[PDB]
Design an enzyme around this catalytic site. Structure first.
Site, mmCIF file in Angstrom:
data_model
loop_
_atom_site.group_PDB
_atom_site.id
_atom_site.type_symbol
_atom_site.label_atom_id
_atom_site.label_comp_id
_atom_site.label_asym_id
_atom_site.label_seq_id
_atom_site.Cartn_x
_atom_site.Cartn_y
_atom_site.Cartn_z
ATOM 1 N N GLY A 1 -5.480 1.946 -5.337
ATOM 2 C CA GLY A 1 -6.400 1.756 -4.226
ATOM 3 C C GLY A 1 -6.728 3.028 -3.465
ATOM 4 O O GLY A 1 -7.103 2.976 -2.292
ATOM 5 N N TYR B 1 -5.142 -0.226 0.536
ATOM 6 C CA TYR B 1 -3.941 -1.009 0.776
ATOM 7 C C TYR B 1 -2.810 0.000 0.817
ATOM 8 O O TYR B 1 -2.482 0.605 -0.204
ATOM 9 C CB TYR B 1 -3.732 -2.007 -0.363
ATOM 10 C CG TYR B 1 -4.914 -2.093 -1.306
ATOM 11 C CD1 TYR B 1 -5.167 -1.078 -2.218
ATOM 12 C CD2 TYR B 1 -5.797 -3.168 -1.255
ATOM 13 C CE1 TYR B 1 -6.245 -1.139 -3.082
ATOM 14 C CE2 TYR B 1 -6.884 -3.240 -2.110
ATOM 15 C CZ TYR B 1 -7.105 -2.220 -3.028
ATOM 16 O OH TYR B 1 -8.178 -2.269 -3.900
ATOM 17 N N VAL C 1 0.859 1.572 -1.703
ATOM 18 C CA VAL C 1 1.045 0.647 -2.818
ATOM 19 C C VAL C 1 1.116 1.363 -4.151
ATOM 20 O O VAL C 1 0.443 2.371 -4.365
ATOM 21 C CB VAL C 1 -0.034 -0.443 -2.839
ATOM 22 C CG1 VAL C 1 0.434 -1.633 -3.657
ATOM 23 C CG2 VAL C 1 -0.390 -0.863 -1.421
ATOM 24 N N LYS D 1 4.475 -2.383 -2.944
ATOM 25 C CA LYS D 1 4.090 -1.673 -1.728
ATOM 26 C C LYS D 1 5.333 -1.372 -0.897
ATOM 27 O O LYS D 1 6.206 -2.234 -0.724
ATOM 28 C CB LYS D 1 3.056 -2.478 -0.931
ATOM 29 C CG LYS D 1 3.258 -2.521 0.585
ATOM 30 C CD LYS D 1 1.953 -2.906 1.310
ATOM 31 C CE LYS D 1 2.224 -3.734 2.559
ATOM 32 N NZ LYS D 1 1.018 -3.877 3.436
ATOM 33 N N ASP E 1 -5.387 -9.075 1.609
ATOM 34 C CA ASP E 1 -4.964 -8.545 2.914
ATOM 35 C C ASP E 1 -5.173 -9.613 3.985
ATOM 36 O O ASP E 1 -6.141 -10.364 3.907
ATOM 37 C CB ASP E 1 -5.834 -7.336 3.296
ATOM 38 C CG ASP E 1 -5.192 -5.998 2.931
ATOM 39 O OD1 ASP E 1 -4.170 -5.632 3.559
ATOM 40 O OD2 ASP E 1 -5.754 -5.267 2.076
HETATM 41 C C1 LIG Z 1 -7.354 -3.747 -7.292
HETATM 42 C C2 LIG Z 1 -6.228 -3.101 -8.089
HETATM 43 C C3 LIG Z 1 -6.012 -1.731 -7.432
HETATM 44 N N1 LIG Z 1 -5.216 -4.127 -7.901
HETATM 45 C C4 LIG Z 1 -4.509 -4.374 -6.749
HETATM 46 N N2 LIG Z 1 -3.654 -5.388 -6.670
HETATM 47 C C5 LIG Z 1 -3.038 -5.450 -5.425
HETATM 48 C C6 LIG Z 1 -2.091 -6.402 -5.030
HETATM 49 C C7 LIG Z 1 -1.592 -6.323 -3.754
HETATM 50 C C8 LIG Z 1 -1.947 -5.279 -2.882
HETATM 51 C C9 LIG Z 1 -1.495 -5.318 -1.502
HETATM 52 O O1 LIG Z 1 -2.538 -5.099 -0.659
HETATM 53 C C10 LIG Z 1 -2.010 -5.260 0.567
HETATM 54 N N3 LIG Z 1 -0.740 -5.593 0.621
HETATM 55 C C11 LIG Z 1 -0.397 -5.639 -0.706
HETATM 56 C C12 LIG Z 1 0.933 -5.995 -1.138
HETATM 57 C C13 LIG Z 1 1.524 -7.074 -0.527
HETATM 58 C C14 LIG Z 1 2.771 -7.464 -0.922
HETATM 59 C C15 LIG Z 1 3.398 -6.778 -1.938
HETATM 60 C C16 LIG Z 1 2.811 -5.726 -2.575
HETATM 61 C C17 LIG Z 1 1.588 -5.351 -2.168
HETATM 62 F F1 LIG Z 1 1.034 -4.324 -2.792
HETATM 63 C C18 LIG Z 1 -2.940 -4.375 -3.247
HETATM 64 C C19 LIG Z 1 -3.442 -4.461 -4.532
HETATM 65 S S1 LIG Z 1 -4.539 -3.387 -5.295
#
Ligand SMILES: CC(C)Nc1nc2ccc(-c3ocnc3-c3ccccc3F)cc2s1
Ligand SMILES: CC(C)Nc1nc2ccc(-c3ocnc3-c3ccccc3F)cc2s1
Ligand SMILES: CC(C)Nc1nc2ccc(-c3ocnc3-c3ccccc3F)cc2s1
Ligand SMILES: CC(C)Nc1nc2ccc(-c3ocnc3-c3ccccc3F)cc2s1
EC number: 2.7.11.24
Lengths: 338, 338
Positions: free
Chosen positions: B28, B32, B35, B50, B165
């Site tokens: 990202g 986010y 992460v 994250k 989010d």
């Molecule tokens: C679009 C591509 C880059 N795929 C992504 N897949 C995710 C999946 C989640 C996150 C995330 O975004 C905000 N909080 C979290 C998060 C919350 C809890 C545990 C781990 C975390 F990463 C960002 C992304 S980017």
């Protein structure tokens, strides 16, 4: 539009209610704050008018004041104290420094009712039905009383009851045992445990867990529902708590059938589903409503849920005046019911 | 039980994940937070890990950290980021000073999808269906995102989408117009307005209200939904706001049928029920689900509600260590899913 107010003293305090409110006299000997019983010439209804005490004299108080006007303004349900009126002598924000609340006046609390007194399985069946009806409503705005008891349960000579005080020198006995673990977040069924302790008292006309202190209470409780098993002790986050219980003599689960004898077997089975140690296994309000015991009262189509309730405000950290204004905005935003 | 961790640098920061997590690479570009995309040897699933940034370096942060672990630990629904793992190198409370979160890795955000790009009424119909499915779930734990957009809506090459989010230098456009009145409490349908602005963009492949600033946005909005009537202006508590709108040239309500032409008449009627000025008149998530447009996807029996969610914590005012411990308790209280 601005009514005609009339000043007068009432408990070392100048009440400036509108002329429409007559015959103000103190009530509850002091319990429910600075409350006054009055007559509403506009509706001919006997009303309870409570004056908010030094509302804006500290951040802790302004936020607290906002918080009450926010809850009360939301409580629109048959079995919960709702606002009939909200007024203020002030004509400006500047002037604003008092808040008066108005709701129906009530007969008495379940205390005055029961307490060494016994009623009919129809009365208990109804009373409890209503407690659960309000709980189910509140519980849906994601609101937990956390401390339901007879003191805050009020009925009018007709057996109709409103949840009076709440929610999201008297003693315990109706609180959920787990409140003693000072947890931070609880299952709503903490309020169900309280119901069970009121239900049973209605029936038996006797205090279920009349514990003398924190320890007496846990002992009294465990005495009937049996000491926590293994998998349950896991739930307890504190090691002190875990060990404490384990340190005690294991007690077997008594049979409510033997404790509450002569009483309805339907109530008993119910009580059995409420007075449980695992708050995660207790019956929700909504569930207990479809229970047999309240079959002659039940009615899915008339057991409503609250509108959503945005308490995001609790997360904010504002200044005395900021909260004070919000309240003013809330006061001038109140729209009496029909 | 204690896994075997492995240290390594990742963006000026030492990540000490367990060996089970392999191939950690940032993602990202910075959006986010901190992460990292990894491979879960234990499940063979591609995961997003994250790392919570300086979690306990201030009360504002500890409470904030608790708050996230509290929300995430509750989010158990098909269309919402849920915790797969929560870990910490530390072996004691004393050691505890870091929190790592784990959830499924995703394809991309609706941004990468749409944006100047057009999809099939089946894709839009599905995508929107899911957004509403998660909204309906969240909205029942009494949780309001308040700022839904494409940036926080993610889908996996399969058109399955999770609300990424939330909730209870990019720009606006999807926020509810009323958020500009900095209100204190809102209707959940603030999130419905956002959906409408995503739905329409999916269809038109064009930003609905690409407002340049606070004023441009209100103008752009009013341009389609028509200037607030009288009874509605009453709702606005601020006199500045009331006058501002009145000060502007009354605009008539355009017909979405003319704005969104070539597009499905079912979507249009829907959009018409969402993009409304009176948030109190907007359609709830749940309502829009039974709407025609999602008839080939609807299914009352599979559109679940969240368990209750006790956010009483926000009302508490604790100390850095106090919040820190609560979090620890939460971390050691996490129970991975099946
Ligand atoms: C679009 C591509 C880059 N795929 C992504 N897949 C995710 C999946 C989640 C996150 C995330 O975004 C905000 N909080 C979290 C998060 C919350 C809890 C545990 C781990 C975390 F990463 C960002 C992304 S980017
Ligand atoms: C039992 C006899 C004394 N009848 C009572 N009827 C009531 C009715 C309500 C109250 C009250 O208790 C706590 N807050 C309020 C309150 C809330 C909003 C507006 C006005 C209020 F008084 C106390 C009582 S005592
Ligand atoms: C999770 C389930 C089984 N529910 C409860 N498990 C307990 C365990 C203990 C207590 C308690 O009660 C009165 N004193 C204690 C106590 C004693 C020593 C240290 C800390 C204390 F809090 C209440 C409860 S409720
Ligand atoms: C209750 C309904 C009709 N909903 C909204 N009524 C308004 C009214 C105004 C505004 C606004 O938008 C951008 N600037 C203003 C504004 C302009 C001057 C002073 C204060 C401001 F906030 C947004 C909204 S949303």
């Amino acid at each position: 539009e601005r009514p005609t107010f009339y000043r007068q003293e009432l408990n070392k305090t100048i009440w400036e209610v509108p002329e429409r409110y007559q015959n103000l006299s103190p009530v509850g000997s002091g319990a429910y704050g600075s409350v006054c019983a009055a007559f509403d010439t506009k509706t001919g209804l006997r009303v309870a008018v409570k004056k908010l005490s030094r509302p804006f004299q500290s951040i802790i108080h302004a936020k607290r004041t906002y918080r009450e006007l926010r809850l009360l303004k939301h409580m629109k349900h048959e079995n919960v104290i709702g606002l009939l009126d909200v007024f203020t002598p002030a004509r400006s924000l500047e002037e604003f420094n008092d808040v008066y609340l108005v709701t129906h006046l009530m007969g008495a609390d379940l205390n005055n009712i029961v307490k060494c007194q016994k009623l009919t399985d129809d009365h208990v069946q109804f009373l409890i039905y209503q407690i659960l009806r309000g709980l189910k409503y509140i519980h849906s705005a994601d609101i937990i009383h956390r401390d339901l008891k007879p003191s805050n349960l009020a009925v009018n000579e007709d057996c109709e009851l409103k949840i009076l005080d709440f929610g999201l020198v008297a003693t315990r006995w109706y609180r959920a045992p787990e409140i003693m673990l000072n947890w931070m977040h609880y299952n709503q069924t903490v309020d169900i445990w309280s119901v069970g302790c009121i239900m049973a008292e209605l029936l038996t006309g006797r205090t279920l867990f009349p514990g003398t202190d924190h320890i007496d209470q846990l002992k009294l409780i465990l005495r009937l529902v049996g000491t926590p098993g293994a998998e349950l002790l896991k739930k307890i986050s504190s090691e002190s708590a875990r060990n404490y219980i384990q340190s005690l003599t294991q007690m077997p689960k008594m049979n409510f059938a033997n404790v509450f004898i002569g009483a309805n077997p339907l109530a008993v089975d119910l009580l059995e589903k409420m007075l449980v140690l695992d708050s995660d296994k207790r019956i929700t309000a909504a569930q207990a409503l479809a229970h047999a015991y309240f079959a002659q009262y039940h009615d899915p189509d008339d057991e409503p849920v609250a509108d959503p309730y945005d308490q995001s405000f609790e997360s904010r950290d504002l200044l005395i005046d900021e909260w004070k204004s919000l309240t003013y905005d809330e006061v001038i935003s109140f729209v009496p019911p029909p």
